[PDB]
Amino acid sequence: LQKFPATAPADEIYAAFKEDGCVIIEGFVPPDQMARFSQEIQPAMEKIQVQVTNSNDRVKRFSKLVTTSPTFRHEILENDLMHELLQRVFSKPGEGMGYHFNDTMVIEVQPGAPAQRLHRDQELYPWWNSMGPDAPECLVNFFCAVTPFTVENGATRLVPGSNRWPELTLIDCPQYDSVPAIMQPGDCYMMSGKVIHGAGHNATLSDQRRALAFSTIRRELRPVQAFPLWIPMQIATELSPRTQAMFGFRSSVHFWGNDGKDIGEHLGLISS
Amino acid sequence: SLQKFPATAPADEIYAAFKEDGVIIEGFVPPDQMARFSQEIQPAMEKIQTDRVKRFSKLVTTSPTFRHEILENDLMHELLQRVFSKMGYHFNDTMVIEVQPGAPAQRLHRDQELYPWWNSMGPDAPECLVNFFCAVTPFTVENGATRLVPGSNRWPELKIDSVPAIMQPGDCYMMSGKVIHGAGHNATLSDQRRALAFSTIRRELRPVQAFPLWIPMQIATELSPRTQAMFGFRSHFWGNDGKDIGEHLGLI
Ligand SMILES: O=C(O)CCC(=O)C(=O)O
Numbered sequence: 429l430q431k432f433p434a435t436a437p438a439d440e441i442y443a444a445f446k447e448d449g450c451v452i453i454e455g456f457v458p459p460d461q462m463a464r465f466s467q468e469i470q471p472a473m474e475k476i477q478v479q480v481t482n483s484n485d486r487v488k489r490f491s492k493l494v495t496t497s498p499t500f501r502h503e504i505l506e507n508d509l510m511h512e513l514l515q516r517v518f519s520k521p522g523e524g525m526g527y528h529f530n531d532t533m534v535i536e537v538q539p540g541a542p543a544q545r546l547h548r549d550q551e552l553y554p555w556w557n558s559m560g561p562d563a564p565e566c567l568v569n570f571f572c573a574v575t576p577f578t579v580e581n582g583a584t585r586l587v588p589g590s591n592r593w594p595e596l597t598l599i600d601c602p603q604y605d606s607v608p609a610i611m612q613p614g615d616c617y618m619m620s621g622k623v624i625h626g627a628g629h630n631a632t633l634s635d636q637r638r639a640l641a642f643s644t645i646r647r648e649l650r651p652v653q654a655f656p657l658w659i660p661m662q663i664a665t666e667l668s669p670r671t672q673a674m675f676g677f678r679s680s681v682h683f684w685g686n687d688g689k690d691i692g693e694h695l696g697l698i699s700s
Numbered sequence: 701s702l703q704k705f706p707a708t709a710p711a712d713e714i715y716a717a718f719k720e721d722g723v724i725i726e727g728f729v730p731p732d733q734m735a736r737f738s739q740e741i742q743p744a745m746e747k748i749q750t751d752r753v754k755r756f757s758k759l760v761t762t763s764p765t766f767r768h769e770i771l772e773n774d775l776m777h778e779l780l781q782r783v784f785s786k787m788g789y790h791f792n793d794t795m796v797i798e799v800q801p802g803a804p805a806q807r808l809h810r811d812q813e814l815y816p817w818w819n820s821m822g823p824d825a826p827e828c829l830v831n832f833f834c835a836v837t838p839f840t841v842e843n844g845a846t847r848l849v850p851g852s853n854r855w856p857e858l859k860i861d862s863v864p865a866i867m868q869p870g871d872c873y874m875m876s877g878k879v880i881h882g883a884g885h886n887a888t889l890s891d892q893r894r895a896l897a898f899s900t901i902r903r904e905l906r907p908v909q910a911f912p913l914w915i916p917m918q919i920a921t922e923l924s925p926r927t928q929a930m931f932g933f934r935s936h937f938w939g940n941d942g943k944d945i946g947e948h949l950g951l952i
């Protein structure tokens with residue numbers, strides 16, 4: 429797993445991403461912004477009841493971020509490097525923006541919580557493993573640290589070469605060896621949907637491991653969150669245009685449109 | 701390699717024909733519904749203007765007959781369950797395409813070029829898109845009936861022999877995204893070939909129409925629950941933290 433500062437050119441960061449399916453970006457989010465956001469979402473996180481048994485076994489998952497945290501909708505969402513890398517991954521010259529959000533979720537592995545099974549994120553699109561290691565990307569998660577990731581508080585366990593394996597399968601597996609995603613608040617891993625990984629078991633006793641996941645998918649795929657339905661137009665009018673398209677308030681013809689027109693015309697976001 | 705079945709035909713006998721040839725269903729939509737629907741969308745279609753083809757998608761808001769009768773077709777869902785489910789399908793688009801006198805032939809294509817990676821998955825790939833292309837007015841060799849190619853789905857690598865899609869009002873052609881086809885030249889002087897397209901796609905795929913964002917909720921409440929999920933007003937995809945989006949919108 430290579431590592432870059434977020435001051436590094438996008439061509440550089442994305443090259444390691446293509447090769448290994450997986451890069452680490454240091455200060456991908458400014459640590460002051462991450463702690464404002466984290467502070468802002470805290471009354472809501474406290475209001476979440478942990479379950480013990482499931483992917484929600486002693487894990488907090490919370491997606492109401494753009495509606496709850498001003499720092500998220502105004503500053504954290506407006507990451508230029510993210511869009512450079514997303515552009516390079518998903519977009520074709522002349523087709524607009526080739527990507528949108530699948531989900532934007534804070535995941536907090538509680539203490540004692542168990543190692544999540546080794547999966548690929550692209551198992552969500554069941555057919556995608558068949559196109560093989562040389563398939564186009566469907567999914568890229570920018571899995572960010574809100575609080576520190578240690579090996580023992582549940583840092584994501586990643587397999588670096590998974591990106592290029594012979595047969596991408598449901599991990600029916602013939603090899604049935606993982607590395608922790610150690611990082612500091614503000615860092616992030618940028619992970620292909622081809623990369624095998626899973627949450628780590630939080631062996632600590634009070635270290636609530638908090639993360640901020642930006643799950644992005646190609647324009648032609650349906651997201652797990654019905655964002656433009658449950659986000660209010662009040663918040664949407666505070667987002668930048670590229671961010672409104674991230675959440676399905678714009679079409680920025682091809683998909684998610686109104687008779688070939690952008691849906692944002694209908695919603696008032698675009699005026700002729 | 702192209703078969704025709706009634707609408708009383710057993711859905712598997714219909715799905716078995718779809719599967720190997722990539723199926724015609726006579727009387728898919730009852731002719732009297734299709735007739736009334738076409739009457740309701742007619743003012744709005746009057747209100748529309750080198751390509752000499754009219755396309756109209758605001759069917760759920762325009763037409764009570766479509767909204768309440770034509771959308772509720774139990775055979776359309778029996779077949780989509782057999783094609784997509786492991787509700788594992790939703791709508792891609794609902795369009796009235798009306799080809800006008802003199803309009804040229806449209807280029808042959810597979811509908812699944814919309815998801816540009818699907819052809820690479822070959823002729824044994826899972827289905828991404830099913831179109832139920834139902835005839836509103838009659839289709840004839842003259843007025844530009846669709847040209848289709850029946851075995852072109854099963855081809856190893858995804859000027860050409862074809863069949864015209866001859867049908868009466870109410871008949872559908874149920875067509876895989878893998879099937880090559882194209883509207884014909886409308887050579888008539890007066891025959892506006894009107895058609896009704898149900899483009900359906902599997903649940904993991906995005907639609908070209910942002911239905912739940914332009915169909916008003918005054919309409920959305922007068923859809924059956926399966927038809928609300930068809931249009932994106934219910935839901936695991938398209939949710940609200942795993943919870944059904946239907947709740948937050950008040951329909952559940
Ligand atoms: O939190 C982690 O370490 C991984 C989480 C993950 O992979 C998921 O939420 O699907």
Ligand SMILES: [Mn+2]
Pocket residue numbers: 547548549625626
């Ligand atoms: Mn995952």
Ligand SMILES: [Mn+2]
Pocket residue numbers: 809810811
């Ligand atoms: Mn077509």
